[PDB]
Design a protein around this ligand. Structure first.
Ligand code: LXJ
Ligand code: LXJ
Ligand code: ZN
Ligand code: ZN
Ligand code: ZN
Ligand code: ZN
Lengths: 360, 360
């Protein structure tokens, strides 16, 4: 069975399980079950399933170099699928809530869930909550007798929290830390002194890397009973590196990818995001360029957004990007080599993860 | 040590733990730690701590009739305190998010968290997320080697999900089930055919009773290693009963308690809530009264709200309330007696829970 087709079949099984349980234990009626079914399909389905399929892929690598009964292979693959759907539903939680937080309009070329006419923010906040609760309902049902249950739950928990922390880093990234105060309306930074590589790196590490790269890799190890076969510090370090590279691409596209290809009109400039373009610009700009930037960044006015985009074009940030990229390729390959010491076949799963990130 | 003073001391300890961990493992800076500290104090502190103190109280009852070393008593009480704070933080999660969902203005005589000038909805949705993640960080840290950890996590998980389900029942309670559809803007019901006691009961059971009564009672049993000493079906049945009574009081106050005593301007009528007043009214009204109700319910217009309040006064719902109350007193006392069979001292903790609900 091809990995993708196995993974999508399990979606159906998990969906049927969750909804049958709502009926039989939670007194749901058919119409509210239908609403939740559509919510699940709309918020969970339609991407590439890179995160979920990572769990499956790691697990397949382990199976190919380990002795198991056929029924144990199926069990392990089914577990990887379920584990993968937990990460996919965790993302869907965060995407629903983040879209509401940010006033987003579109996502993957369709309206954000909260904007559906029969949804509204009042319901969508709660729907987002449900999406995360379903992660835990999955885990407890399918992994009830599994030896990895505790470690999986504890890991999941920590990634979740890290992601929420990162969300806090992200939405506060345009304020001056020393002015943060629940009592006082927050001004945008005027100096941009916190648009640094170290600061940028923290936002991304927490907001994106833990749930996108670390979790899928380590969950693939946990369901395979393979974690003690790899050096975990290396898994952490390579995840953070690749996850950083992923976000830098996403930042570059926000500004330069046409909206019909992005699936989104990008607003990073208008939202004054601590983006890789702004940090990297500020790291090479002269005084005049910096002042022009401060006079136009973080304002909805299209003329002002056009000025910042001009500044970024003239600043030759493609060069700094290719230099960043070259250094990431070096470090990732170094970490892949280090991972060959104890786990050559895991190393190759990491290599496929890096290739799919590096190309797309 | 008095139970309240122990419980509030543990808040400080848990707060210091969470924030020290953010610094030492999550790269937080002092200002963002300060923001989270204030968020925690603002959203977790200031109520009666009925839910959290329930866990402590159950545990104290067990200690008084069981043999333990002094250090084991302290351990058990500390665990009950931590367990209690998990429920208190779970409530704070739901209160933050519900206030945003509903456009609430005030809560306990102060502004809702999202309305704080330096917060905003963009941050508060995420702050609400954090509040729930902290429940799991507590549990994993303080209960890592505890024999009850799995059952506590599994219970917590199920209550959480039930509460989110109930929130869905609540916010959809004024729509016709057969019209629910994410694609189509939802009209308010015109027939009010779903304002029934069975329907009302489901909203409340899920939205409120599981996290307010069932969870605190059963968590008190789990930390005490006492769950196999009580009949769990009876704990469920008495929790649902008391939790229903609690909500009926809350519904009655929304409409009749002056806003300075409520801590809130009540909007149940304007929001067209499936409230005990509306259901009970509809269960005794004549044709004329029903038509007048349909012509004024669920509309912000103060004249229209005043009409509904008049209808409720003239309808003599105090009588149906005293009849409801008498029946609840009967059933609760019956269940308390049933609980004396296997667990007399637990029965008394349930009796204190009922008294504190019945009087306040
Ligand atoms: O137990 C082991 N010791 C040597 C090691 C040799 C090859 N293996 C891996 O590279 C591998 C590890 C984790 C997950 C997927 C694959 C399998 C595990 C083997
Ligand atoms: O193991 C037991 N069997 C009889 C029973 C007699 C009294 N007990 C209770 O009523 C009790 C139960 C759970 C929590 C708090 C108190 C203690 C447990 C005792
Ligand atoms: Zn965002
Ligand atoms: Zn982006
Ligand atoms: Zn509400
Ligand atoms: Zn109310």
């Amino acid at each position: 069975m091809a990995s993708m087709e196995r993974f999508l079949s399990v979606y159906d099984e998990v969906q049927a399980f969750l909804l049958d349980q709502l009926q039989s234990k939670y007194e749901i009626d058919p119409n509210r079950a239908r609403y939740l079914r559509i919510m699940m399909d709309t918020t969970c389905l339609g991407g590439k399933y890179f995160r979920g399929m990572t769990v499956v892929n790691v697990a397949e690598g382990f199976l190919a170099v380990t002795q198991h009964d056929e029924a144990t292979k199926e069990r392990i693959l089914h577990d990887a699928c379920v584990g993968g759907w937990m990460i996919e539903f965790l993302q869907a939680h965060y995407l629903v809530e983040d879209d509401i937080m940010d006033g987003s309009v579109m996502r993957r070329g369709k309206p954000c869930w909260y904007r559906f006419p029969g949804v509204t923010t009042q319901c969508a906040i709660n729907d987002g909550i449900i999406l995360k609760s379903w992660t835990q309902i999955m885990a407890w049902h399918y992994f009830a007798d599994r030896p990895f249950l505790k470690d999986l739950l504890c890991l999941f928990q920590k990634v979740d929290y890290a992601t929420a922390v990162g969300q806090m880093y992200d939405v506060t990234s345009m304020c001056d830390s020393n002015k943060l105060d629940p009592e006082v309306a927050q001004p945008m930074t005027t100096d941009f002194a916190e648009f640094t590589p170290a600061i940028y790196k923290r936002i991304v590490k927490y907001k994106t890397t833990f749930y996108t790269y670390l979790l899928p890799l380590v969950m693939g190890l946990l369901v395979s009973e393979a974690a003690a076969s790899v050096e975990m510090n290396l898994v952490e370090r390579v995840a953070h590196l690749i996850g950083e590279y992923f976000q830098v691409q996403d930042d570059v596209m926000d500004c330069f990818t046409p909206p019909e290809q992005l699936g989104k009109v990008g607003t990073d400039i208008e939202d004054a995001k601590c983006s890789w373009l702004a940090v990297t610009f500020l790291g090479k700009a002269n005084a005049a360029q910096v002042a022009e930037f401060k006079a136009n960044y973080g304002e909805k006015d299209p003329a002002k957004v056009a000025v910042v985009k001009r500044l970024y074009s003239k600043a030759n940030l493609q060069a700094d990007f290719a230099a960043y990229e070259a250094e990431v390729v070096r470090e990732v390959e170094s970490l892949i080599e280090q991972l060959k010491v104890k786990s050559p076949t895991f190393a190759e799963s990491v290599a496929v993860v890096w290739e799919k990130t590096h190309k797309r």
